[PDB]
Nucleic acid binder design. Structure first.
Ligand SMILES: Nc1ccn([C@H]2C[C@H](O)[C@@H](COP(=O)(O)O)O2)c(=O)n1
Ligand SMILES: Nc1ccn([C@H]2C[C@H](O)[C@@H](COP(=O)(O)O)O2)c(=O)n1
Ligand SMILES: Nc1ccn([C@H]2C[C@H](O)[C@@H](COP(=O)(O)O)O2)c(=O)n1
Ligand SMILES: Nc1ccn([C@H]2C[C@H](O)[C@@H](COP(=O)(O)O)O2)c(=O)n1
Ligand SMILES: Nc1ccn([C@H]2C[C@H](O)[C@@H](COP(=O)(O)O)O2)c(=O)n1
Ligand SMILES: Nc1ccn([C@H]2C[C@H](O)[C@@H](COP(=O)(O)O)O2)c(=O)n1
Ligand SMILES: Nc1ccn([C@H]2C[C@H](O)[C@@H](COP(=O)(O)O)O2)c(=O)n1
Ligand SMILES: Nc1ccn([C@H]2C[C@H](O)[C@@H](COP(=O)(O)O)O2)c(=O)n1
Lengths: 187, 26, 144, 187, 187, 187, 187, 26
DNA sequence: CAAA
DNA sequence: CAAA
């Protein structure tokens, strides 16, 4: 049949990749959320591979974030931001995802206050006990609301009841300001 | 058989007066 | 013969009666009761050739009728006479036009419809009825 | 590939946000349903963040609501109302969602009788034991059926068997009378 | 982004609603299936709210039906019939749904023999242990095959192993012979 | 809103129906797979209703098939074959489905060797412990590769670990060489 | 209704099939991942049938791969690569999938280092305890980044906590440089 | 080779009479 | 439009 | 259309 060439999320190609291992310390919206990026992706297309241990040193119900620095060049008020996640947890905790936007004068944010995070729900492919999947996008104003900060976007992952255990998968996210060209056999 | 390309129909419009209503009404 | 518009069935009452397909070999045959042989009485060893004569003639009158004179008016017209529309109480055909309905194809333009076409028949037309003198109160009906 | 720019639900952008914490008292359709909004969103685009405890002080099988005040300006008989939810519960209860419409002369409804609520089913992204997800919409007549009331719409969340426990996520909903413009690289 | 205005099922608007409580007696296809409608929806758009107890007084594996009377006015051979369901059961039984068509000289069918029911599978949004969801449609000949009966359509719900327990949700179904108009901001 | 009239699978209408009861003996690809059709659907549109017991008299991990005889009239090299399944099992076994093609000089195949079966994966609506759902299609060459046989297609259902128990639902499948006409209100 | 002829993945037709049995030794990204293909599909359309035992002789959390050799003829920078998987595991482990790209001067790779593998997330149809399903695609640069190697693509399957047990299903993958023609009744 | 853009075909329509059916039938 |  |  005819191959479908449209998609809610195009995963960055050869660039913007960072592997993250270690302990992921989920947190509650009342505190500061963990932004597991020290070498935070730039090109505003980010692919993050996960192979770490979901540790509950803090609260049992929280959320961690993966982010990227929004390119603000475009004069357009706002553009689309897509994400594509695939996470498999060991400890049944019924994960959950979505897209977020937050600012910070800091270039490489390590954590962001929950009262400083904006949410954008997205259709979750799946949300089983140990695996959340999703490939979707949302509309987000790309310009810094406070003269001075850098704008950040990414997918956030939460749970009502986390469970210590290894987590693995990929967290991809992109600011659509380019549609990847592709061999379409009939043109 | 008429050539033209289909036109939408206009007014249902004569002899003497029909409508007496008390004066002029548009 | 339907007495009232309520003796009419679903389809008819809403859409009109059905008519005959355009005349062709099977849609326009010879009236089903068409004579395929005419028998004539014979004695046992002889035949009236003078009778055989009338016999044929008679058949003729019968066929002439069967074939194209089933209606009274047609029979009279046959003698070279005429019949008012009031004679056999027949509607008066005041005007009859006809035409072929043509149109165009709309081309498909999307990934899957591209290369497909839908036909939109759409013909304009005039149906003009020359001034007509209405002798008695009645109805002017126009059907398609 | 080509980025998809259509979507069943556009989450409000910088405005219309309210965080709700505390106890959510699910109820049965025979009683009055809890409308967890005191500061009920106006612009008729609503984003509600949840970080509260699902408490069963009443019945074990019920439903709670999140709502917004429909803008009735449009002369159009009715417009589309989209919702995008992502809820993760601790207590396995097999959540469920949908869109609803109800009127009330009250400006800030605290609860609405079940026999006064209209339902509009929507494809649920997921409905696992502890997480319901959905991004869809439905057609709803936007004009007040009873001369005088204000029209409300929102997503309702129900369960056949609830279970005391923390719930977290986002409840977004919008009345489409505006499609957010967006940078489309090829135009 | 651009709001999507197409959908497999449009839930009836202000009309055709009936609430059903009590005991739902699922049955096997070898017997007569329970049609939980006494006041069966007419306009051939039906919305049914469920708040009853799934009781297994008969067999443990069966199915119940929700139906509506098909409008046969249309001269078109057959039209589309969409359904949108959201059911949350207490007793884990892995529900299942689909669309059905059946005739009966009876105006308000209370039950229909299984050997007299026609099936039309539909993509199930979800089919977890305690919640089935689905918003889809199917092509169905709308004219009475036996000179005299009335044609019925609706969604059927089955299970391989039912489990006594309360069930809640909505069962919507419609015969598409009208597409609801809607405010589309850009026209 | 606008009603969607496209779909990956159109379930046959008034014809091609066969009910199958009894014992379904799943098998492994190393042996001969059970083709539960004696009165195998012809018109190459098949609807099969299931109300039987999933018995493990052979291996614990296997697969059973539902098939139809492909119409080979079309000069087109190959056409689309859609399937729409909804199965609810009692015994948790995590079902799975897909479309298959196989030939056989036999008119009414009772079983087919696994090394003689061709697979075509399809997006599974759901694949929970006790219910698999799917409505999709695939491209399949419709002409007999071996001068003489009849071509068969259908959906196959497998499991890594089956479990004795009743199964219920519908197995629909069709060779698209006809798109069912349908009342579209706006034309 | 109208049959849908577009699709994210077209499963290869009569060619490119390989059956794989035996032990699948999942591995962690810190080591070398198992590429279960000795007779690796060529035509860059691959269909792989699985009937083997998921063995944990190494680590409990890992991932295995199924791959194909990318045709590099096309002068186009990059083309689409679709995959369609259906896996049913015995041992509940919450599987997970995605598409990958990796190079190697070796013609028939037996394993590939994790730090040498590129990820491309895809919407997972399902991700239950014992069955992952997915039919999607992604954009991938098809030219060898290191003058000399052959480019490989395929679907990878991972888990946070594997569990010894039989696995069954199909792993299909294709490089779209051809759209299969198909009988469309209305043209 | 004829220039024109494809036209749909009309009537299958001469000498003397063919169809005798008893009288006039439209 | 007094088709006064 | 009596192609009487
Ligand atoms: C002649 C052509 C027109 O349709 C008809 C009426 O014209 P008028 O313009 O409404 O008379
Ligand atoms: C038309 C509109 C006017 O009311 C009517 C008489 O117009 P006049 O101007 O009196 O005819
Ligand atoms: C003679 C032959 C035609 O059918 C009839 C009318 O022709 P016109 O072209 O509509 O007169
Ligand atoms: C008018 C003028 C004519 O004399 C009268 C009857 O016309 P006809 O033609 O018979 O009607
Ligand atoms: C010449 C051109 C036409 O196709 C053919 C018949 O014409 P008529 O118009 O049906 O004769
Ligand atoms: C054509 C339609 C008519 O029945 C037939 C003879 O017409 P006339 O009028 O007798 O020719
Ligand atoms: C006619 C109607 C009156 O009898 C007469 C007078 O005409 P005008 O209208 O004034 O003419
Ligand atoms: C020819 C048929 C008859 O023999 C003769 C008479 O012609 P008309 O038809 O009246 O002419």
């Amino acid at each position: 049949m005819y191959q479908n060439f449209v998609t809610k999320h195009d995963t960055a190609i050869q660039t913007s990749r960072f592997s993250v291992t270690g302990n992921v310390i989920p947190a509650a919206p009342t505190g500061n959320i963990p932004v597991i990026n020290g070498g935070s992706i730039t090109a505003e297309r980010a692919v993050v591979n996960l192979y770490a241990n979901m540790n509950v040193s803090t609260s049992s119900d929280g959320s961690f974030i993966v982010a990227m620095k929004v390119d603000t060049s475009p004069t357009d008020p706002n553009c689309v931001i897509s994400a594509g996640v695939n996470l498999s947890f060991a400890g049944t905790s019924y994960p959950i995802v979505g897209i977020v936007r937050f600012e910070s004068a800091s270039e490489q944010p390590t954590s962001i206050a929950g009262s400083e995070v904006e949410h954008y729900p997205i259709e979750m492919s799946v949300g089983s006990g140990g695996v959340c999947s999703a490939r979707d996008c949302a509309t987000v104003d790309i310009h810094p609301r406070t003269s001075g900060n850098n704008v950040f976007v990414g997918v956030i992952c939460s749970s009502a009841k986390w469970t210590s255990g290894r987590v693995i998968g990929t967290i991809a996210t992109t600011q659509v300001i380019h549609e990847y060209q592709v061999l379409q056999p009939l043109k | 058989a008429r050539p033209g390309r289909p036109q939408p129909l206009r007014g249902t419009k004569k002899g003497a007066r029909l409508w007496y209503v008390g004066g002029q009404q548009f | 013969t339907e007495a009232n518009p309520s003796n009419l069935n679903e389809d008819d009452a809403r859409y009109g009666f059905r008519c005959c397909h355009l005349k062709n070999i099977w849609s326009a045959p010879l009236p089903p009761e068409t004579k395929l042989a005419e028998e004539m009485g014979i004695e046992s060893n002889s035949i009236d050739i003078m009778g055989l004569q009338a016999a044929y003639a008679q058949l003729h009158t019968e066929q002439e009728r069967t074939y194209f004179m089933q209606r009274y008016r047609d029979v009279i017209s046959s003698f070279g006479g005429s019949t008012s529309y009031d004679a056999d109480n027949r509607p008066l055909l005041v005007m009859h036009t006809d035409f072929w309905a043509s149109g165009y194809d709309v081309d498909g333009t999307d990934q899957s419809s591209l290369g497909q076409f839908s036909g939109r028949v759409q013909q304009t037309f005039k149906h003009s009825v020359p001034r007509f003198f209405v002798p008695e109160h009645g109805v002017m009906m126009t059907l398609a």
